[PDB]
Design a protein around this nucleic acid. Structure first.
Lengths: 37, 50, 113, 332, 102, 198
RNA sequence: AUCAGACGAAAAGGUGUUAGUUCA
RNA sequence: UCGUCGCAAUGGUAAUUCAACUUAGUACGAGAGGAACCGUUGAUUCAGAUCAUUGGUAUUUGCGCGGAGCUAUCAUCUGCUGGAUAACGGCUGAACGCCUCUAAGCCAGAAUCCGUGCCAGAAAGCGACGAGG
RNA sequence: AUGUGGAACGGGGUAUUGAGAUUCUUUGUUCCCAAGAUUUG
């Protein structure tokens, strides 16, 4: 308790396991990539 | 439980008896050591009691 | 209670967002002096001493990253001394610490922010 | 002044941070350097998520008052042999490298323009003329030493600093045998090592440095502790200020260079917090004396986005490049 | 991370910089700088400020909450599309500036 | 499932239990989340996602079983992560409304939702369309005051969670399983189970 | 003698002793 | 003679910490009470501080703003750790065939002590090293 | 201390400012220049 690492990517329904374990862009060149994709 | 639950549990560590015997044998030495090491008012009270 | 106190804007006159019949509840004393955004503190009704979690805080509250956000006013939602919200329903944004301080206060809140 | 740990307060003479206590080493440890000299590039705050068990912000992004330290790769240009004596630790013999830069040679010369600039010139002569003498000096070190440290000079030329005299610090090679330490330094003589080799950036580095002179107010050497590095960005890397989230390329140098330091061109180390001493100051990044296992050291760094708002002056954008199309076409 | 737009200066807002304001009507206002925040507190009209981008746009001087499944190919295509869109926007802005100057 | 997250009995406030998935919030006890996983997590995913960094996001989560139409105050990155974390069948939507605590405001029973009396009709209809449950604008915090589910969680005294007026906050009522807090009264829990045909 | 000795808290306590006396 | 890069005789010392939510309504406890426990969040007070970013700035006498930089946790860092022990508890074991923490001894064990770390260094403390006839 | 020399200008950048001006940097110009005394060794 308090030292166990819990990953939210494991509990995913993504088709590609690699995509679920890989982060996605958030902001790029002053523009929110995550909010504009 | 209720009432004398602790007494009931006792009725229902065994090494304490062996420890008590060791303490009893060392009690004679402990009394002399405590009396010789006591200082102040406590030393006078212990001497008066003895 | 619930949650751990964190360094934030000690905004909460603490406007009683909770629908306890009081629009404003001036903070009489800080429970456990000022209370951060979402921290319950003793508050004597200013308009309309009881705990008052600051659902909205006029002072800019540094976020988790450090994003300081300032609400319209230092609104302390009225909370009963037990911990539950004294008012039927809180109004305006409800701070995340107010949810931690009292889930009922966040539950009573129409808006949680 | 209540803490007499720092009282009496007197200004530290040497600007360079002095390693009063090097980390302990053993043969099991591989031969490695314990300290690396850096320059106070800047310390803007950059966002980063915190993956920490039990954290209130577990898996939540956090803006962090981190610190960029310009770290030109250090050059080892000599060795010192330390004999364990009942009266202390004595320097047996010092074996310098054959060839030295003008900058490190300048360190010895107060003026450097005086007459002939003869620093180690005959020493360079006898070094090549009699390599066997250096072999005997190396043999004497390996035979009669316990603590081997390496002479290292700063590549200020890479940095945008007016100072020409290369700061020389006696970094200590740690791990392995004394002969192994001598061999590593000998094969590394007249060669430079990046801080990325010295520190892995997951390591907790207790950077030490001299506090600035307030105008005895300030100017005192201090040892920061519990400062894990966040990104040892190399100078050639233009993606150093571009993390995975802010993939768009951006140099660690923000708009308007750095405050009273200029741009960064060489390797740097990213580390949260602040350290004593003003901008562009020689900072002693060194291995931690204690192998602290705090969860902050255990958790890795996953930097969200590097702030690159304007240095000296004021900037409302991460880089001008994105601001070029962000604002309308200028009069020009 | 989302880059908000300033209410007064109409500029990007980065974490740590700027001021965020919340109104009684659940309205969020962002100020790019202290001067923008001071102007907002002074009830300054955004269209009445020469330096404000709102006035520049409406004066002739200038020209998704639905969740979606992640796709690596879509992100890769969008990376080049954003650069192409920015280049096209820059060319259009340059043409507009040249026409305005003439 | 009358279980309390850590020592907090506000199961509904902590988790917005719905038939398809229980909209739990991050910060709850790992064992309690596993307990919620054991009770109804398999049928109703109990992923603890703090909407907008709130541990009581379940109170404010306006996402029901058919549609995760939670308020837009939920973090976009978390919502995007939850969209990948949860199955696409749940109509995940961001309810951009002034009443950010729409889940507390709306008693979004899987059969028929019950929005707040002052809740926006368009926002209620949008939440109703995603949740596939007809909204009923009707304390204002209908979801927080009274637990709502297709199975049936009776109504507040004006009471679940040891007579707490906020039955919805105390009890995480879902069509698959009408969960509640550990402090829920035995008579109240039995009545809720009887209301839920259990 | 861990408060040596050399220059009243002192009554006592000494599973602290050294020698001897008495009864034994 | 001028420097380089170091050792340390000798002092001083610091962080005091708790507080509140999990870890907990946790084992144990009829139960209440409540461990062990685990991180996080902060905070009482005090110390050395950087001055990046921000607030103030303030003869830029540039243009109220105010650069370049300074001050301000008002932007931020930020305060160590291994043995020996006190009481007490034990092991071994005589005296006092056994027994007996103790008498020869040892271990565990205090917020105690010692060192470690930090701050200095001995203007007359030293070593290696480069450059008077 | 005869040089990628240093420094001052002509400046420019950085920002300030909110169309205008200013101030670390400069393959530009020039000044400066093997820059003199004192002190010991």
């Amino acid at each position: 308790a308090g030292v166990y690492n819990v990953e939210l990517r494991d509990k995913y329904i993504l088709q590609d396991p690699s995509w679920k374990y890989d982060r996605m862009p958030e902001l790029l060149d002053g523009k929110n990539v995550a909010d504009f994709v | 439980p209720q009432n004398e639950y602790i007494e009931e549990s006792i009725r229902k560590r065994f090494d304490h008896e062996e420890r008590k015997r060791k303490k009893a044998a060392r009690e004679a030495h402990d009394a002399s050591l405590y009396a010789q090491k006591t200082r102040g008012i406590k030393a006078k009270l212990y001497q008066e009691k003895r | 209670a619930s949650g751990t106190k964190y360094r934030m804007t000690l905004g909460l006159i603490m406007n009683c967002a909770d629908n306890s019949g009081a629009k404003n509840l001036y903070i009489v004393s800080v429970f456990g002096p000022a209370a951060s955004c979402g921290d319950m503190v003793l508050a004597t009704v200013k308009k309309g001493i009881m705990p008052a979690i600051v659902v909205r805080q006029r002072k800019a509250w540094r976020r988790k990253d450090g994003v300081y956000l300032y609400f319209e006013d230092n609104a302390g939602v009225i909370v009963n001394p037990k911990g539950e919200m004294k008012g039927s329903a809180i109004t305006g944004p409800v701070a995340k610490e107010c949810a931690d301080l009292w889930p009922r206060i966040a539950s009573n809140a129409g808006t949680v922010v | 002044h209540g803490s007499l740990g720092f009282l009496p307060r007197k200004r530290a003479s040497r600007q360079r941070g002095k390693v009063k206590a090097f980390p302990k080493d053993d043969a099991s440890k591989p031969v490695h350097l314990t300290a690396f000299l850096g320059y106070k590039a800047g310390m803007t705050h950059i966002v980063r998520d915190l993956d920490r068990p039990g954290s209130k912000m577990h898996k939540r992004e956090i803006l962090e008052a981190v610190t960029v330290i310009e770290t030109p790769p250090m050059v080892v240009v000599g060795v010192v042999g330390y004999v364990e004596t009942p009266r202390g630790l004595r320097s047996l013999t010092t074996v310098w490298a054959e060839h030295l830069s003008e900058e490190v040679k300048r360190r010895f010369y107060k003026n450097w323009f005086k007459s002939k600039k003869k620093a180690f010139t005959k020493y360079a002569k006898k070094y090549a003329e009699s390599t066997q003498s250096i072999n005997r000096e190396l043999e004497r070190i390996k035979k009669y030493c316990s603590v081997v440290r390496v002479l290292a000079h700063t590549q200020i030329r890479k940095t945008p600093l007016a100072q020409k005299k290369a700061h020389l610090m006696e970094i200590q090679v740690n791990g392995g045998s004394v002969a192994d330490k001598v061999e590593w330094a000998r094969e590394h003589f007249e060669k430079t090592v990046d801080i990325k080799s010295t520190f892995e950036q997951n390591e907790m580095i207790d950077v030490i440095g001299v506090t600035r002179g307030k105008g005895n107010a300030g100017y005192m050497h201090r040892t920061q502790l519990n400062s894990k590095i966040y990104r040892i960005g190399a100078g050639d890397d233009a993606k150093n200020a571009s993390t995975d989230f802010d993939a768009t390329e951006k140099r660690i140098t923000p708009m308007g260079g750095f405050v009273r330091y200029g741009v960064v061109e060489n390797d740097f180390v990213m580390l949260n917090g602040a350290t004593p001493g003003p901008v562009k100051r020689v900072l002693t990044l060194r291995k931690s004396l204690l192998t602290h296992t705090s969860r902050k050291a255990l958790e890795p760094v996953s930097l969200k986005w590097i702030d690159t708002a304007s240095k000296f002056g004021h900037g409302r954008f991460q880089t001008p490049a994105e601001a070029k199309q962000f604002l309308g076409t200028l009069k020009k | 991370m989302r880059v908000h737009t300033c209410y007064f200066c109409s500029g990007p807002v980065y974490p740590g910089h700027g001021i965020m304001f919340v109104r009684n009507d659940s309205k969020v206002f962002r100020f790019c700088r202290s001067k923008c925040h001071k102007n907002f507190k002074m009830k300054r009209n955004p269209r009445k400020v020469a330096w404000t981008k709102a006035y520049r746009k409406a004066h002739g001087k200038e020209m998704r909450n639905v969740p979606v499944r992640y796709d690596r190919n879509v992100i890769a295509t969008t990376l080049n599309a954003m650069k192409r869109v920015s280049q096209v926007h820059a060319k259009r802005e340059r043409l507009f500036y040249k026409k305005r100057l003439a | 499932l009358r279980a309390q997250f850590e020592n907090s009995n506000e199961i509904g406030v902590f988790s917005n239990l719905t038939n398809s998935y229980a909209l739990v919030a991050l910060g709850g006890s790992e064992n309690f989340y596993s307990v919620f996983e054991a009770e109804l997590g398999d049928v109703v995913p109990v992923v603890h996602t703090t909407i907008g960094g709130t541990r009581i996001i379940g109170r404010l989560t306006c996402g029901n079983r058919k549609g995760l139409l939670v308020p837009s105050s939920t973090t976009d990155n978390e919502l995007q992560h939850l969209r990948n974390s949860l199955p696409d069948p749940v109509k995940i939507q961001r309810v951009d409304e002034r009443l950010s605590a729409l889940g507390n405001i709306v008693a979004c029973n899987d059969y028929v939702a019950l929005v707040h009396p002052d809740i926006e009709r368009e926002t209620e209809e949008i939440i109703a369309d995603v949740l596939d449950v007809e909204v009923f604008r009707q304390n204002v915090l209908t979801g927080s005051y009274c637990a709502l589910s297709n199975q049936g969680a009776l109504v507040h005294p004006r009471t679940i969670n040891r007579g707490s007026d906020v039955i919805g906050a105390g009890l995480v009522v879902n069509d698959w399983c009408a969960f509640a807090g550990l402090d829920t009264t035995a008579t109240e829990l039995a009545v809720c189970e009887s209301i839920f045909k259990l």
